[PDB]
């Protein structure tokens, strides 16, 4: 699980960096795929902080 | 802040012994604390529409009561001299006029009269742009140009349009006008201003009103001119 979780955090930080750059479509794509992975593998509440950060970033 | 019933003003139409130890304290509004009555007290003890403070506060919070053209939803709102009180669901319109017996009473007035308020000028100030701010007897203010402010003096009266925010008419303090005593002992007396002793302090000058042969005396601070031989607004 640790490899999958760490890889998910990498895609989350890359999504937040792209969102900070302004690439909202790319960040939304990364968020959707990482969200699907978390929903299937049960890591949603584990990645709850980064999900909230990326959602706030894409709202901004 | 609390108001002990003993410290409540003596003219208020409430019992002095039978009841609780508290009285509804007016909420620092557009009158004096000792020359005004709270709106809940008006609704419960003056009109008898509400049997408790809860019912009075419900009636006030619905916005059924209007004071001087503005809906008042605060149950502690002060009500004072010459204020127009309007009940919305019933259509009844009162003026808070000076009274010989209750010292201050709600007398019904016409709907055409309900939009006017006779306000006694209480002072003048110079404000920015060179304008003149008139301060009236209930704390209301009106900013005017200097030429109109120059000819209006202290202790004059103005009939003021609440809806237009304008001075409908100006009644200067001259000998022979009709005046009403708005304060102490000789309260509610209407008569002709026919005699003055001008003390060094103008507010403390001795004034005498006449109603045929009925001569009463007060100080200049305690009278308000309500026009010539016929009062402009229905006060009685």
């Amino acid at each position: 699980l640790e490899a999958v979780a760490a890889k998910l955090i990498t895609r989350l930080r890359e999504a937040e960096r792209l969102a900070l750059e302004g690439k909202t479509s790319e960040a939304k794509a990364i968020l959707k795929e990482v969200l699907k992975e978390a929903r299937e593998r049960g890591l949603e509440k584990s990645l709850r902080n980064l999900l909230l950060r990326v959602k706030a970033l894409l709202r901004r | 802040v609390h108001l002990r019933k003993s410290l409540a003003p003596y003219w208020w139409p409430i019992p002095r012994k039978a009841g609780g130890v508290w009285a509804v304290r007016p909420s620092t509004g557009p009158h004096s604390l000792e020359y005004s009555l709270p709106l809940a007290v008006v609704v419960r003890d003056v009109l008898r529409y509400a049997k408790t403070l809860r019912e009075a506060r419900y009636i006030i919070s619905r916005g059924y009561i209007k004071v001087d053209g503005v809906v008042r939803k605060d149950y502690k709102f002060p009500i004072g001299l010459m204020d127009v009180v309007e009940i919305v669901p019933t259509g009844e319109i009162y003026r808070v006029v000076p009274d010989e017996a209750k010292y201050y009473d709600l007398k019904p007035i016409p709907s055409s009269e309900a939009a006017l308020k006779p306000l006694r000028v209480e002072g003048k100030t110079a404000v920015s742009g060179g304008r003149i701010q008139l301060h009236f007897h209930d704390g209301r203010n009106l900013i005017l140009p200097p030429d109109v402010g120059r000819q209006i003096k202290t202790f004059d009266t103005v009939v003021y349009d609440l809806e237009n925010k304008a001075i409908k008419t100006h009644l200067p303090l001259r000998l022979g006008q009709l005046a009403v005593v708005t304060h102490g002992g000789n309260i509610g007396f209407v008569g002709q201003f026919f005699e003055v002793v001008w003390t060094l302090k103008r507010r403390q000058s001795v004034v005498a009103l006449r109603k045929g042969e009925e001569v009463r005396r007060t100080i200049l601070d305690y009278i308000m001119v309500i026009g010539t031989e016929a009062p402009v607004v229905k006060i009685s």
Binding site: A6, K7, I9, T10, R13, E14, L43, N49 | -
Partner: protein, 140 residues
């Protein structure tokens, strides 16, 4: 001295606690808050990339008194606290005398809080993708 070190990954939001002992005890003693020690020292406890440097963020003593970064030396002190680090006022403007300890690590410390430092330009995986108790609850 024996320690219960919390190590926080700033990229995963998680933390892991290791009981630190005899060889690393003298390495942790003598360090002021914010000091820099490379992550290779924790090779026997955690597998870190060779770009992560562990910074000393704080600690708590034998009786729970937290390390105040604004106080120097390895000392126990009473301060009239009005701010967050060592005091959480329940009323606005309320000041209190609160026991704290210095920024220097001693042997009376029971908890040491430290956070990773990833290298500049790093874009790899987080050092701690999950907590131990979190993984245990996930598995069950």
């Amino acid at each position: 001295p024996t320690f219960k070190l919390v190590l926080s990954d700033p990229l995963s939001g998680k933390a892991r606690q290791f009981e630190i002992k005899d060889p690393l005890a003298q390495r942790f003693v003598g360090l002021r808050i914010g000091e820099e020690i490379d992550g290779t020292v924790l090779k026997e406890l955690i597998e870190l990339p060779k770009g992560v440097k562990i910074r000393i963020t704080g600690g708590s003593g034998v009786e729970g008194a937290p390390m105040h970064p604004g106080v120097p030396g390895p000392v126990k002190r009473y301060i009239l606290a009005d701010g967050p680090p060592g005091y959480r006022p329940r009323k606005r403007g309320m000041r209190k005398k609160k026991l704290v300890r210095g920024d220097t690590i001693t042997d009376s410390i029971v908890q040491i809080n430290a956070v990773l430092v990833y290298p500049e330009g790093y874009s790899g995986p987080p050092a701690i993708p999950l907590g131990a108790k979190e993984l245990e609850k996930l598995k069950g």
